[PDB]
């Protein structure tokens, strides 16, 4: 599994691969690992499928629950804390092999400077969180490959579209070196999913745009 997130001027993009495995076997080819959790945030999760799906679903419910009860959404810091507490609550199960780690991406409507209101937050098994300030982050078995790729490509990110291209290429590099991360599948037409978030909110990136970028990366390396 590989999920990446990176900041670009004015927003953030998060993208994830589509593979699920059971040992060496490829058990799924179209899993969606990145979720829009509220109007300004997306969550991508790696590790145990059952736990990750429940995290995303319960977390979205918790954010909207607060909003309906209090009349206003939680501050971005509050959203981070809720996700951290949820991860911490899974610690016992996680030590038993039910371990899932989320990656959070968001746009802070209350930030002073809009061009940099993008946020990326990572989490560890005990609920520790870290607001990433180097521009990008990744989780999953292919994360080191993705991060080393983004380290070299990040200077090319100047807007949402180039941010999306770098994210897709980082997932491409993860799949190239990690057998547990799925590459673009041209035969079946299945590609990584992505979510872009800017001042207008979080939106799913249409598959056709990703397919286009993936084909260009492949052409380029051929």
């Amino acid at each position: 599994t590989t999920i990446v997130a990176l900041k670009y001027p004015g927003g953030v993009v998060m993208a994830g691969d589509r593979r699920s495995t059971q040992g060496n076997m490829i058990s799924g080819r179209d899993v969606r690992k990145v979720y829009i959790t509220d109007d300004y945030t997306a969550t991508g999760i790696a590790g145990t499928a059952a736990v990750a799906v429940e995290f995303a679903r319960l977390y979205a419910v918790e954010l909207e629950h607060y909003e309906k009860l209090e009349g206003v959404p939680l501050t971005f810091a509050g959203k981070i804390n809720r996700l951290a507490i949820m991860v911490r609550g899974n610690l016992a199960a996680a030590m038993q092999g039910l371990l899932a780690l989320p990656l959070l991406a968001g746009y802070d409507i209350h930030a002073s400077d809009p061009q940099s209101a993008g946020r990326i937050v990572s989490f560890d098994a005990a609920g520790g969180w870290n607001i990433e300030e180097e521009g990008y982050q990744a989780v999953g078995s292919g994360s080191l490959f993705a991060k080393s790729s983004m380290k070299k490509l990040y200077s090319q990110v100047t807007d949402g579209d180039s941010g999306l291209r770098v994210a897709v290429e980082a997932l491409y590099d993860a799949a190239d070196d990690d057998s547990a991360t799925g590459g673009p599948d041209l035969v079946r037409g299945i590609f990584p999913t992505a979510v872009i978030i800017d001042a207008d909110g979080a939106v799913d990136v249409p598959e056709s745009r990703i397919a286009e970028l993936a084909r260009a990366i492949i052409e380029s390396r051929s």
């Binding site: 679903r57 419910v61 629950h65 309906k68 009860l69």
Partner: protein, 216 residues
């Protein structure tokens, strides 16, 4: 304690406080459901979102109906999580308030001085007539087809609605008809919101300030 006398006193005690409070109206219109309440406060609200296509409006003692509002949101979120979002319905919420108010009315020191309205509009791209339910202090529930009126002196507002009401009125026409039947007041004394059937998921939408100004 005589069962007769008690049920009589408690009742009046609630009817009284409710009629003593501001009024609220909810009516079906072309775009979904419209909520209009006489409300001076800027912070304390009488109209609220419950779930994706379900809205809430109340009249009476605030601390008591806000209590119910929270309880309702709690119920809905828990249901949708335990089953699926699309399994939560206006009918279920109304049914729950009835059971809750009936239980309060019967088991609590003081009955709740409130009157509630639960409304539901169709799911996006779906076609279904809005539903409006009214739940009383005693726990009585009623299925209203066009509009609901609660709080203060309803008679005047009720009738005013009866002459004016138009199935499929546009938002503006509905707003006017409502604000009128209510007088039977401007943006600084009104709480307005709609269950907009045209919204993809969350139908609840507040109409305030300049935007509200325009419409009225």
């Amino acid at each position: 304690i005589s069962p007769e006398q008690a049920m009589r006193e408690r009742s009046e005690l609630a009817r009284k406080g409710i009629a003593r409070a501001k009024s609220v109206v909810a009516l079906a219109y072309a775009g979904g459901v419209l909520f209009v309440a006489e409300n001076p406060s800027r912070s304390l609200q009488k109209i609220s979102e419950l779930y994706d296509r379900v809205g809430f409006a109340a009249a009476g003692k605030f601390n008591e109906f806000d209590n119910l509002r929270r309880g309702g949101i709690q119920f809905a979120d828990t249901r949708g999580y335990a089953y699926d979002r699309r399994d939560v319905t206006g009918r279920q919420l109304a049914n729950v308030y009835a059971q809750t108010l009936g239980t309060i009315f019967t088991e609590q020191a003081k009955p709740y001085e409130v009157e509630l309205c639960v409304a539901e509009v169709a799911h996006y791209g779906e076609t279904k007539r809005p539903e409006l339910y009214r739940i009383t202090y005693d726990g009585s529930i009623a299925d209203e087809p066009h509009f609901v009126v609660m709080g203060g002196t309803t008679e005047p507002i009720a009738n005013a609605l009866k002459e004016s009401y138009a199935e499929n009125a546009s938002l503006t026409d509905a707003l006017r008809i409502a604000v009128a039947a209510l007088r039977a007041l401007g943006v600084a004394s009104l709480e307005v919101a709609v269950l907009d059937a045209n919204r993809p998921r969350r139908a609840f939408r507040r109409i305030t300030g300049s935007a509200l100004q325009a419409l009225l």
